[PDB]
């Protein structure tokens, strides 16, 4: 649809473009809200708004309302990688309590795995799963005990994280500055300092695009000291 092409263009734009794409799709919800191809794009635009927003209650609102649109997209059919991908993203943005993070983390893993199964050549899903695995490996003993009681035990590993981050790089070299810092962290945590230094050098080559890109520059400067 022309509308959905315009929304795609605006999602790929600057901050002003992403805000316009959000309002463009909201303005069209009455007419197009029964269509899965519209719903996941509206969810995506909520996710854009959540990322661009600083004020905490406003950021939360975008993630909550976006997640409901992504759920409506998934009710239309289970075979859309885009539906599962953006549901996972919003799941993670909303989950930014331990009980709620655990249930969100279980849902995140199911949907990112389905996105990868449906569309394995999409680098973003692999990056998302790498970061999930890194976070799960880094849970405290108590947080793991709490997750095992609430859910199967969690057992994702630094190697699982590394393999997913490297798959994003293989599909799209330079996909993510944060991803390169996470690869370097993973190698250091494995005791592979030569590889960690290689990826630290490559991480320094990429620009910042996300809030996390800017935040993880702290971790990258700490690696330059550690290594
Ligand atoms: C396409 C488009 C451009 C601008 C806006 S507005 O920001 O709400 O006025 C909405 C939609
Ligand atoms: C399964 C699971 C549980 C908890 C987290 S957390 O968001 O890093 O706390 C992520 C994933």
From Swiss-Prot:
Induction: By EGF, TGFB1, retinoic acid- and 1,25-dihydroxyvitamin D(3). Present at high level in epidermis and seminiferous epithelium: while basal cells in the epidermis and spermatogonia show no perceptible amount, keratinocytes of suprabasal layers and differentiating first-order spermatocytes up to spermatids exhibit high expression. In skeletal muscle, its presence is restricted to fibers of the fast twitch type. In surface epithelia containing ciliated cells, it is associated with the microtubular structures responsible for ciliary movement. It comes from the Eukaryota. It is found in: Mitochondrion outer membrane; Cytoplasm; Nucleus; Cytoplasm, Cytoskeleton, Spindle. Involved in cellular calcium homeostasis regulation. May participate in differentiation and apoptosis of keratinocytes. Overexpression induces apoptosis. Belongs to the RMDN family. Interacts with PTPN2. Interacts with microtubules. Interacts with VAPB. Interacts (via FFAT motif) with MOSPD2 (via MSP domain). Interacts (via phosphorylated FFAT motif) with MOSPD2, VAPA and VAPB. The transmembrane region is required for mitochondrial localization. The FFAT motif is required for interaction with MOSPD2. The FFAT motif is involved in the interaction with VAPA and VAPB and its phosphorylation regulates these interactions. This is Regulator of microtubule dynamics protein 3. The lineage of its organism: Eukaryota, Metazoa, Chordata, Craniata, Vertebrata. The chain holds residues 239 to 468 of 470 of the full protein.
């Amino acid at each position: 649809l022309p509308l959905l092409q315009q929304a795609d263009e605006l999602h790929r734009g600057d901050e002003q473009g992403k805000r316009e794409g959000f309002q463009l799709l909201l303005n069209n919800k009455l007419v197009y809200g029964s269509r899965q191809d519209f719903l996941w794009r509206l969810a995506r635009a909520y996710s854009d708004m959540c990322e661009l927003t600083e004020e905490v209650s406003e950021k939360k609102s975008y993630a909550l309302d976006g997640k409901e649109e992504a759920e409506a997209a998934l009710e239309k059919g289970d075979e859309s990688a885009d539906c599962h991908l953006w549901y996972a993203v919003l799941c993670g943005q909303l989950a930014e309590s331990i009980q709620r993070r655990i249930q969100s983390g279980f849902s995140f893993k199911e949907h990112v795995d389905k996105a990868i199964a449906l569309q394995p050549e999409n680098p973003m899903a692999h990056f998302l799963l790498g970061r999930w695995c890194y976070q799960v490996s880094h849970l405290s003993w108590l947080e793991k005990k709490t997750a095992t009681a609430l859910l199967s035990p969690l057992s994702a590993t630094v190697e699982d994280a590394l393999q997913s981050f490297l798959k994003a790089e293989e599909l799209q070299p330079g996909f993510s500055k944060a991803g390169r810092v996470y690869i370097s962290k993973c190698y250091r945590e494995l005791g592979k300092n030569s590889e960690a230094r290689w990826w630290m050098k490559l991480a320094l080559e990429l620009p910042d695009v996300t809030k996390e890109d800017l935040a993880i520059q702290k971790d990258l400067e700490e690696l330059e000291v550690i290594l």
